Structure formats: structure tokens, C-alpha cells
Design a protein around this nucleic acid. Structure first.
Ligand SMILES: [Mg+2]
Ligand SMILES: [Mg+2]
Ligand SMILES: [Mg+2]
Ligand SMILES: [Mg+2]
Lengths: 41, 55, 83, 160, 49, 177, 120, 86
RNA sequence: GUAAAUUUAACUGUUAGUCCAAAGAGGAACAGCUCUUUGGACACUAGGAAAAAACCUUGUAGAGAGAGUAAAAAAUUUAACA
């Protein structure tokens, strides 16, 4: 019982994320003492 | 229930307060919040990756 | 001791084959952020307003101008939500 | 003192990339088996959580998990509400490991069960073939058959 | 799926990249000596019939 | 994951501030890596409709160098609009007048010619010298590496490297030099 | 003007260098040619397109068998530049009546009589 | 991609052509029963079946043509003996 | 090796043709030039060569948020002398 119309995508996932969804800081390391580039203290 | 996670229907107040309360039941020390990564701090879109460490 | 990629930023990766050699398995626990790699915690009018927020959001001034009623009515008021 | 083929250190003396050496195969074989068996007892003990899966079906891939819907652009001749066991899986992975095939996994390793729930005629897709200044035009409307599956649950076997 | 895998589990895609990079070194080792050597462990193929 | 909806979506499509040092680098290669980072192509979740671009900051745009005589050969031409307004300036003269110029119109060709161009252009930042305001210097993320290695000079080559390098030929003593 | 090109027969005489390359022994020659089309039928003379249709190779990437005899050789010689040729060789003898259905082709021109569809 | 590599080992340049990626059954009943064959698999088997029946027809005809000549040559050598005997 | 061909019954329409390659003729061994012959394309879709009729890939048509291929991205720097 749902109107036949266009479907935005051919599937649906309720829990699509395992191992954590990608954010920009997944694939880069950290810095000793937690320092930004070109910073003394 | 599969769709909605915990804190969508079961809203809570003072989560870190409840956290420290639960951790004392589990017999561990009081954790400290520390920003691990940062981006756009002075920008109008601040972004911080805060982690809670104990021992 | 040889590794294909530096195992110090995302996860400690190691590949493995069954002894028959028909399937490959991987073990990739995420890295633990060390404590050393952290830090301690601690009116106006149209002209001036459209440029200062553009300088604040780092964008152009075009999208901030108001659109016509033609587009405001075409905007969907009950969009579908996923998950 | 120096080998005849030896060259001093320059930019073009050696390639730009760094030299590498692969490990010996014997200890690697013991490493291949050791890392497998600790993963075998890991899944037997049940340390894993979710397990996603990739599937080859109907001439196309999908990333799928449990309790998720999926559509196919044809009819399978299955009554509504029936369950089916899918054979082909390219890989399945949990929170801390992954099981990739060559190309697919074994039959006894996995058991991917899915139920058929619903079958539509596709929404009316219109097509128009037209050519300019020659009075060539035509119309046609298709309603292709579609079926909605759902992967009820996925499990893995201790065999490895 | 190769793209979608990188979206949600970069740890898995890292294994795919690590799997891919190891085959390159196996292929370059084969470029030095085509035969007359033990073939790559991952470069070994399955024969269907 | 175990992240909430809105915070997780925010961290995914969030922006980041790159930093690059232009000392002895070509404007093209730094433009090539920059342009792909401006649309957000580096993000696996890229989509042109979603403005998932990221900011980029360049330093030492004055201390750039071409490969060839493009300091003299290359010409940057423009037209004001009036008759005779068509002028041409070499890359050297254009550098003397504006060291920020060479990169900003160089990236301008790299990224596509859409209306998202000018949004991504102003998002990018440039500085002729290694002096930055504390505001834009504090909101940094990561300094990606340089494309090309910088060759070392004779004063920079240590003595143990020269001693390791073997002399090649015998000079006859009967020579003035 | 452009016309049908007669080819010298001397070109199609394998030397010992060619024998060692392709591994085709002259004695005990194969019987059947596996034929497949790669180049388009278009932009070719009327005699070139109908011959390949007379051979039945209007479809590309479709392996089709012909004889190794001088009569059919003349046909796919003039349109040799439209197709691939590969010889037929089999270890498992001719296809028996019981194994008519479970046959399978290979990229190396092989035709296995048995196909149980799983590795060693 | 990899089409040249696949045909090096003997596999299909396109994996959808033949091999286990497509020839296996794509679904089965949850109770372990075998599903019916697919339409693509049926026409492929009928194609290979007519292909096999064709190749057997092509080979035996060439063998019949070869021996039919030598049977004619044995007849040719026979009637030449008949000539000198007469 | 293939399945078309001849003939019979009844009509229609085309009968104002551009380009490429080749053999030629006129012209200037000029023309996006004109006139013949063999072949191809175009006046039928699609991809590429920048946009492109005529060049290069490709034909029998559909749904797909599948895959492997086809043609397909210009290289050049130049002069010493007893
Ligand atoms: Mg003309
Ligand atoms: Mg003309
Ligand atoms: Mg004319
Ligand atoms: Mg077709």
C-alpha cells in the first residue's frame, strides 16, 4: 500500500555504518604534543 | 526500534554527569575531556574531536 | 617487520590466508590515540550585513539575496527523510 | 672494492621511490595460519557484532546488511513472503575483520537468508524518439516488473 | 561497492589498499624474475574447470 | 560508529584548512593538488551538488619558480574593455607587480568554469610571505607535503657526502685552472 | 581505383621462426578455426560485409567455428582483417552424447567436454 | 579493466562472459532446495549444446571426406592393376 | 560456406546528390571547382577527433545506481675555429 512513483534509490539500509563512517581525520596521523603546523607552544 | 538510536526517544540531561556516576559503579577513575583534533576554531564553523580518557 | 603501509594513524592492519589459500582474512583494530597526542582544554543594513557574513562564512554574496515567490512556492515543504 | 655495476649517490643513481624487501615465505605461512586461527576462535567465541555482506545477484552488485530493503528490476517467480538463500557473496565483514573471497566465498562459510515481501510494476517510464524537420516521432510507456527483497539475517560458519 | 566500501569502513578499504600494494611488490618481483622463483603468495590463482 | 545523526553528518561534510609552503615549487603542481582539494574530490563522499569543498592556504607565493624560460616566454593578457585596452605582461613583470597573482589565476584555469568557481576561489587564501594573522593561522588542520624535492646547493652538501662521492678523473699538474 | 585485392599465396607459408613462435606444429594440423569479429562491418565494401554475413559473424565477440580447408580459406582470407582466428584443440576427446550440455569454452580456444564448476 | 590479464590465465576478458561469477545459481530456497535454472543460463547451455552438436558435425564430415578420397584412391590403384592385367 | 534468387499478379515513389579514397579528363599538376568510373560515408541512432554531414570507432533498438572493450591526447630547436 504505497503509491507507485519514482524511487530515489533502489534499496534502503537502516544501519549502513559499521567501523565508523568516514570523516576527514580518519586517514591521517596525529602530532606530538598536539601541535598544529608551524606552532611553537 | 531498529531505526531510532537510544538518545532519540530516551532523552537525557547531564550526560557526562551520568557518565561519571556510572563509571564509579564500574570502579574506575574520573575521566578527563581533551580535544584530540581541531578545525575551524576561529572560523564560524568550529569543529572539535573530544575524547574521554581514564588512567 | 616489513609492513605495506604505516600502521600508526588508522588501524593495525595484517593480512592472512587460510592454509589452503582460497580465502583472505584481515585484522584491523583501530588505533588508540595516545595522551601525548592531545592538548589540555581551556543595527546595520543590507550592504554591511551581506558582506560581513560572507567574510564570516567564506562564501559569495549571491546566494544570500532573497529569491522570488516562484522558487519559494516550488520548494517542497514535506521532504522525505531517510533512516 | 666497488662492484662494477655500482654507482655513486645521485638523483638518478637509484629510483626516486624507496627500496623495499618482502618477508620470507616460511614465516609468512606461519603468520598466515596464526592470524587466521585467532580470527576463527574469535568468531566462535562471538566477539564480533554486525556483519555486512556484498552480493552478486541479477547481474549487479549491492552492499547489504541485515534488516535492509533491496530492489531488483525483474520478476523471480517467487510467491510473496517466501525465503531464499543467496549463494554468491564477494565479501562479508565485521567490526574488526573481513572475509574476502577468490572471487566469492565458500558455500558452507556463509548463510545469507532473505525474504521476498513485495512486487510492483515499475512507475510508468516514458520514452520519446524524435528527429528534427523530418516528422519522425514516437511514444512508448513501459512498466517493468520489480521485486522487493530484504535480508532477514546473515551468519557465518566456524569452518575456515 | 568499491567506492561505497571506502565511505563507511575506511579500515576495510585500507586492507584493500594494503592488499593491492602488496600485489604490486609481488608483480615487480615478478618483473625482475618472471619464472625461476617462488611465485607470490597472493599472486597465486585459483583454477576452475 | 555509535554517533548521533546531526553530529555525525556535521563531521562528515565539515571543512578543513590545508597549508602549503611555496618555496621552490611550481605554480602548476601546487595548483593541481590544490584544485582537487577545493572541490572536495579528495573526500570519498564527493558530489558536485553538495558544496563539500575545503579551504587552502598558500605561503611564499613570491618564492616560486617555473621550469624553463616561462618567466619570459609566458604572457598573461587581458582586455579592460576600451579600444587599445588589450595589454600583455610577462610573468616576471606580473610577479614584480603582484606576487599573489600568478597562482590565483593559475588555479583559476584548473578548477571548472562554473558559478562554484568564485566561491572556491575566495575560500582559497594566499600570502607572499611567511607571516599570517593569528586568526587564519590558528584555524589550521594539516600541512600537506610539497610535490617536488628541492635540490641541495654546494654550501648545503655536507663533507661526508662529498667524501663518500668518489672523484672521477686525474688532473695533470701542468694546468693553471 | 580500389578493387578486390589478390593476395600472394607465398605470404601464407609459415617459416621455422613462425613455427617456434605460435607452437603450431605443421604435421598433425588442426581441423577447425574459431572465428570472432572485432572490426565493424561498416565502412567496408559490399563484398566484405555480405561474406562475413554469409559466414554468420554479424555479431561481434561471438565465437563461431569454420573448417580448415582451401575453399572456406578463400572466404575469410579476403575479410581476414575483420576477424580473429584461433585453432581448436581439446584433450578430452570429442564431446560424447552424455556430456552435450555440460560444455564450456575458454579464452585459449579450448573446448572442455566436462564442466563441474568448482576448483581443485 | 584487467581483460588482458584474465585471458592470459584463460579466463574471460569480461567476467560476466563465463566462469563462476555468473554460471552458478544466483538464488536458492531457504530450506536448501535447488532453484530452477535462469533464462540466461538456459539459452547459454542451448547455445553451447548446438555449438557442440555443430562441432561434432563439422569434424565427422571432414573425416568422411578424407577417407572417401583414400577409398577412391584405393579404387584408382585397383583399376590400374586391372588395366595391366587385361 | 550460406539462403537467398528467378518468374508470376498489382501499384507507388526515386529519375534536381554533396563529401572522402583511388584511376582519369577540363582548369593553374587553383578552388568547399566541374565532368566520368570502382568503393565508402552522409541524407538512421550512438562515441571520439574542439564545436564538425561526408574523417575515425559502432549497427537491430528495452529496464539497471553491472562489467569488459572499440576508435580516441603531436612530436620538433639548427651550424665557432687553427
Ligand atoms: Mg567540388
Ligand atoms: Mg564538388
Ligand atoms: Mg556544384
Ligand atoms: Mg546489441
Amino acid at each position: 500500500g504505497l503509491d507507485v512513483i519514482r524511487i530515489r534509490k533502489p534499496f534502503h539500509t537502516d544501519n549502513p555504518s559499521i567501523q565508523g563512517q568516514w570523516h576527514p581525520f580518519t586517514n591521517k596521523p596525529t602530532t606530538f604534543r598536539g601541535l598544529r603546523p608551524r606552532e611553537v607552544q | 526500534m531498529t531505526g531510532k538510536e537510544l538518545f532519540e526517544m530516551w532523552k537525557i540531561i547531564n550526560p557526562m554527569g551520568l557518565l561519571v556516576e556510572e563509571l564509579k559503579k564500574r570502579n574506575v577513575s574520573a575521566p578527563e575531556s581533551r580535544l584530540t583534533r581541531q578545525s575551524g576554531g576561529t572560523t564560524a564553523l568550529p569543529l572539535y574531536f573530544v575524547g574521554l580518557y581514564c588512567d | 617487520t616489513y609492513s605495506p603501509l604505516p600502521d600508526d594513524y588508522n588501524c593495525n592492519v595484517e593480512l592472512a590466508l587460510t592454509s589452503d589459500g582460497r580465502t583472505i582474512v584481515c585484522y584491523h583494530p583501530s588505533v588508540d590515540i595516545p595522551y601525548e597526542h592531545t592538548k589540555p582544554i581551556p543595527h546595520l543594513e543590507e550592504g554591511p550585513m551581506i558582506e560581513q557574513l560572507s567574510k564570516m562564512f567564506f562564501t559569495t554574496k549571491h546566494r544570500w539575496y532573497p529569491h522570488g515567490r516562484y522558487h519559494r512556492c516550488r520548494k517542497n515543504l514535506n521532504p522525505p527523510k531517510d533512516r | 672494492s666497488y662492484l662494477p655495476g655500482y654507482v655513486p649517490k645521485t638523483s638518478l643513481s637509484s629510483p626516486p621511490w624507496p627500496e623495499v624487501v618482502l618477508p620470507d615465505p616460511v614465516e609468512e605461512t606461519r603468520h598466515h595460519a596464526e592470524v587466521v586461527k585467532k580470527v576463527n576462535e574469535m568468531i566462535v567465541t562471538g566477539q564480533y557484532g554486525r556483519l555486512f555482506a556484498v552480493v552478486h545477484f541479477a547481474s549487479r552488485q549491492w552492499k547489504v546488511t541485515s534488516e535492509d530493503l533491496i530492489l531488483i528490476g525483474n520478476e523471480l517467480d517467487l510467491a510473496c513472503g517466501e525465503r531464499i538463500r543467496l549463494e554468491k557473496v564477494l565479501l562479508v565483514g565485521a567490526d574488526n575483520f573481513t572475509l574476502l573471497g577468490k572471487p566469492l566465498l565458500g558455500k558452507d562459510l556463509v548463510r545469507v537468508e532473505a525474504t521476498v515481501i513485495e512486487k510492483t510494476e515499475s512507475w510508468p517510464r516514458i520514452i520519446m524518439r524524435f528527429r528534427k524537420r523530418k516528422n519522425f516521432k514516437k511514444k512508448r510507456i513501459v512498466t517493468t516488473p520489480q521485486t522487493v527483497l530484504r535480508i532477514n539475517s546473515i551468519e557465518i560458519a566456524p569452518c575456515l | 561497492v568499491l567506492a561505497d566500501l571506502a565511505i563507511y569502513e575506511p579500515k576495510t578499504f585500507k586492507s584493500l589498499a594494503a592488499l593491492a600494494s602488496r600485489r604490486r611488490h609481488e608483480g615487480f618481483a615478478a618483473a625482475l624474475g618472471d619464472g625461476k622463483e617462488p611465485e607470490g603468495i597472493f599472486s597465486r590463482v585459483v583454477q576452475y574447470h | 560508529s555509535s554517533f548521533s545523526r546531526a553530529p555525525q553528518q556535521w563531521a562528515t561534510f565539515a571543512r578543513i584548512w590545508y597549508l602549503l609552503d611555496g618555496k621552490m615549487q611550481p605554480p602548476g603542481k601546487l595548483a593541481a593538488m590544490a584544485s582537487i582539494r577545493l572541490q572536495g574530490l579528495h573526500k570519498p563522499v564527493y558530489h558536485a551538488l553538495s558544496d563539500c569543498g575545503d579551504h587552502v592556504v598558500i605561503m611564499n607565493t613570491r618564492h616560486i619558480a617555473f621550469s624553463g624560460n616561462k618567466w619570459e616566454q609566458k604572457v598573461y593578457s587581458s582586455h579592460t574593455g576600451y579600444p587599445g585596452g588589450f595589454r600583455q605582461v610577462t610573468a616576471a613583470q606580473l610577479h614584480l607587480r603582484d606576487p599573489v597573482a600568478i597562482v590565483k589565476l593559475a588555479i583559476y584555469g584548473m578548477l571548472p568554469k562554473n558559478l562554484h568557481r568564485r566561491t572556491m576561489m575566495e575560500r582559497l587564501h594566499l600570502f607572499p610571505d611567511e607571516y599570517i594573522p593569528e586568526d587564519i593561522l590558528k584555524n589550521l588542520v594539516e600541512e600537506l607535503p610539497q610535490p617536488r624535492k628541492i635540490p641541495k646547493r654546494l654550501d648545503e652538501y655536507t663533507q661526508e657526502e662529498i667524501d663518500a662521492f668518489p672523484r672521477l678523473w686525474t688532473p695533470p699538474e701542468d694546468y693553471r685552472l | 581505383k580500389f578493387t578486390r585485392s589478390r593476395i600472394p599465396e607465398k605470404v601464407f607459408q609459415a617459416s621455422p621462426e613462425d613455427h617456434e613462435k605460435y607452437g603450431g606444429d605443421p604435421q598433425n594440423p588442426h581441423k577447425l578455426h574459431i572465428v570472432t569479429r572485432i572490426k565493424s562491418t561498416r565502412r567496408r565494401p559490399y563484398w566484405e560485409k555480405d561474406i562475413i554475413k554469409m559466414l554468420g559473424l554479424e555479431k561481434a565477440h561471438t565465437p563461431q567455428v569454420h573448417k580448415n580447408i582451401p575453399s572456406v580459406n578463400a572466404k575469410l582470407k579476403v575479410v581476414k582483417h575483420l576477424i580473429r582466428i584461433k585453432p581448436l584443440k581439446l584433450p578430452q576427446g570429442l564431446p560424447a552424447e552424455e556430456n552435450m550440455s555440460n560444455t564450456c569454452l575458454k579464452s585459449t580456444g579450448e573446448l572442455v567436454v566436462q564442466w563441474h564448476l568448482k576448483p581443485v | 579493466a584487467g581483460g588482458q590479464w584474465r585471458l592470459q590465465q584463460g579466463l574471460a576478458a569480461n567476467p560476466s562472459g563465463y566462469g563462476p561469477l555468473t554460471e552458478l545459481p544466483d538464488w536458492s530456497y531457504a530450506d536448501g532446495r535447488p532453484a530452477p535454472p535462469m533464462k540466461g543460463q538456459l539459452r547459454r547451455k542451448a547455445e553451447r549444446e548446438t555449438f557442440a552438436r555443430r562441432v561434432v558435425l563439422l569434424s565427422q564430415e571432414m573425416d568422411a571426406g578424407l577417407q572417401a578420397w583414400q577409398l577412391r584412391q584405393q579404387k584408382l590403384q585397383e583399376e590400374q592393376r586391372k588395366q595391366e592385367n587385361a
